[PDB]
Amino acid sequence: VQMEYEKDVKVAALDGKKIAVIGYGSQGHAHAQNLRDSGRDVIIGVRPGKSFDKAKEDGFDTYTVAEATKLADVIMILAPGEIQQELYEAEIAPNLEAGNAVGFAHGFNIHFEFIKVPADVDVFMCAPKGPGHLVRRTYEEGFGVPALYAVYQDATGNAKNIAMDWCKGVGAARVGLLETTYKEETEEDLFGEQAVLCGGLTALIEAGFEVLTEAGYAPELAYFEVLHEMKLIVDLIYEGGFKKMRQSISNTAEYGDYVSGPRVITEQVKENMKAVLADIQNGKFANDFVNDYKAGRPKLTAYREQAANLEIEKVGAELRKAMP
Amino acid sequence: VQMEYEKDVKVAALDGKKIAVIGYGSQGHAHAQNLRDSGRDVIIGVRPGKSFDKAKEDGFDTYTVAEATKLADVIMILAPGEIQQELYEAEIAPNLEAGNAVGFAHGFNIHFEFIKVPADVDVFMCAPKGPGHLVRRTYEEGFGVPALYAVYQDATGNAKNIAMDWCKGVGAARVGLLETTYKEETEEDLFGEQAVLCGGLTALIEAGFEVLTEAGYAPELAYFEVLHEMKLIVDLIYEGGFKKMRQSISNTAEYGDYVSGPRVITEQVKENMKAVLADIQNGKFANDFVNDYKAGRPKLTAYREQAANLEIEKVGAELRKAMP
Numbered sequence A, B: 001v002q003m004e005y006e007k008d009v010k011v012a013a014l015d016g017k018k019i020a021v022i023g024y025g026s027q028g029h030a031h032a033q034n035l036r037d038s039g040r041d042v043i044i045g046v047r048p049g050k051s052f053d054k055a056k057e058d059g060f061d062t063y064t065v066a067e068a069t070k071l072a073d074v075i076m077i078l079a080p081g082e083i084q085q086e087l088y089e090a091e092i093a094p095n096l097e098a099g100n101a102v103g104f105a106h107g108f109n110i111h112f113e114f115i116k117v118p119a120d121v122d123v124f125m126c127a128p129k130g131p132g133h134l135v136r137r138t139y140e141e142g143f144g145v146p147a148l149y150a151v152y153q154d155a156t157g158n159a160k161n162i163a164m165d166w167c168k169g170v171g172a173a174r175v176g177l178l179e180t181t182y183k184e185e186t187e188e189d190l191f192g193e194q195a196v197l198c199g200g201l202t203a204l205i206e207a208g209f210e211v212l213t214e215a216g217y218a219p220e221l222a223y224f225e226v227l228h229e230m231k232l233i234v235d236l237i238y239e240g241g242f243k244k245m246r247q248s249i250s251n252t253a254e255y256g257d258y259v260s261g262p263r264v265i266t267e268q269v270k271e272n273m274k275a276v277l278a279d280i281q282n283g284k285f286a287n288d289f290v291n292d293y294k295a296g297r298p299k300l301t302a303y304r305e306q307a308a309n310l311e312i313e314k315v316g317a318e319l320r321k322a323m324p
Helices: A026-038 A050-058 A065-071 A081-095 A132-139 A159-169 A182-197 A199-214 A219-228 A230-248 A251-264 A267-281 A284-294 A298-308 A311-322 B026-037 B050-057 B065-071 B081-095 B132-140 B159-169 B182-197 B199-214 B219-228 B230-248 B251-264 B267-281 B284-294 B298-308 B311-322
Strands: A018-022 A041-045 A061-063 A074-077 A101-104 A122-128 A147-153 A177-179 B018-022 B041-045 B074-077 B101-104 B122-128 B147-153 B177-179
Touching (some): A018 A026, A018 A065, A026 A041, A026 A050, A026 A132, A026 A159, A061 A065, A074 A081, A074 A159, A081 B251, A101 A159, A122 A159, A122 A182, A147 A159, A147 A182, A182 A199, A182 A267, A182 B219, A182 B230, A182 B251, A199 A219, A199 A311, A199 B182, A199 B230, A199 B251, A199 B267, A219 A311, A219 B177, A230 B199, A230 B219, A230 B230, A230 B298, A251 B081, A251 B182, A251 B199, A251 B267, A251 B298, A267 B199, A267 B251, A284 A298, A298 B251, B026 B041, B026 B132, B026 B159, B041 B065, B065 B081, B074 B159, B101 B159, B122 B182, B147 B159, B182 B199, B182 B267, B199 B219, B219 B230, B219 B311, B267 B284, B284 B298
Parallel strands (some): A018 A074, A074 A101, B101 B122, B147 B177
Antiparallel strands (some): A122 A147, B122 B147
């Protein structure tokens, strides 16, 4: 795959199109405002309430989800993943007309087919790889956040042009675009957050904190040596990969990295990751998540409360207050 | 243990002391410049060469290691770990007097007794939890980098005041100090970098990248999904612990974290970490590091050349180029 920029957006396919951003959370706000600022004709579709009035206060023609869908040619759904299906069936699906384009920033619901859009309507993706506030600020400072785009179904023949022009309008084409598919975006993103970025990482930190404190070491220092110091290392990797990080640390740290990394993350861990990937590919994770939501989030409930009781989280909070 | 600040630096024990900083790398430069800006009487001891001239350029009275040691009351050794022993025996030890204080920023060589300092000389530590340029620049902008301080032997009775006044002089007391011991700093620092921050982390990322690319996914998205996106996750952990990070990510991502984290990092991984810790405590890691250095770094050589051949490093370098 080759990375793409503003020069590669061949068609300004959003020209003359009535655009509805569904949701006015952090992400919806960033998308709609960025596009407005770029030149596009943006309205907002929300439940009446906090976000609604803030959208009107922000200067947007705001409506319900249904009427904003009726008025729109392009409808980007930026509600929370867990309410997209219900919101789509109730408010969006009855108001779609052939030749509309329906966008998402995450492939989960379309890929796993919890939502199915009629085959005379385009489904596209623009997935900026950053949080809404950063997508807005980097644009509010004319560069942006790199993004993935994809098309799930192309009824009109313009779906890829709409997705790239969306990524142009929100600033992402300034820094870089990667083409993907709904399936690859969904599965690589679920795997990355589960196996490395969020699950693996937090579990790796927690396991190291437990080894130290169970061996009798001071928890405040352990907090520094498994968590606080991580930011520096990750910043170095972000800017220059393993190579830049391993150049900047001491030779003693570097050698311990090469020697002990493979003793901690073994072949068995790589196997465990494969079983994590398999459950993403075969739909079992997606079903577990959606089932938990439908049951009233009982697993998420237990998880969140156990996590609030962790020693590292209490020690960490105190130390963060002590260091303004 | 509780966090201490400038207020807790009871005595200004560096007052009237001639201070030698041994080494003029980034760490030496930071420590010496901050202390001189703090108004301490700082000379540089380093072998003739560019460092010798860069120090003389920066306005420091600059001598050989042996000659600087002879002039100084307080001698802070900031040469690289691997040469401190030879450097100390040849150049430093002959020029120490009773009531001098010798400083380190890392306890490795004192804790494992590669270096033994006469019993009428203080041995202390001030260990900023950041790299030199950061220790320098934060000082210039009016705050600093947190630090650990410790004392290994206190001959004069002023060792601890000297360590805290050093941390105050380099800016660390602006942010927070933590008292530790030479044994705990050494063993927790070695374990943190090996099990979590450096070794664990890079092996985790690499195992994830391999699982994705061996399963057939595009290497460039995998880079984003196991590496590039980690900066945001870790910044959130740095600012507000797991709690803030888990609030900030999607519920799908957060759910996957709770569910897959413990599948990847198992009890067996925690057992692997315990064996890592044990080889730190029993001195085997230390001896293997020093033996590799004595034999001409042959293991480190192989490791470094293998690291340079990693697909994730080749694909990351291209993408980091494509995203300036």
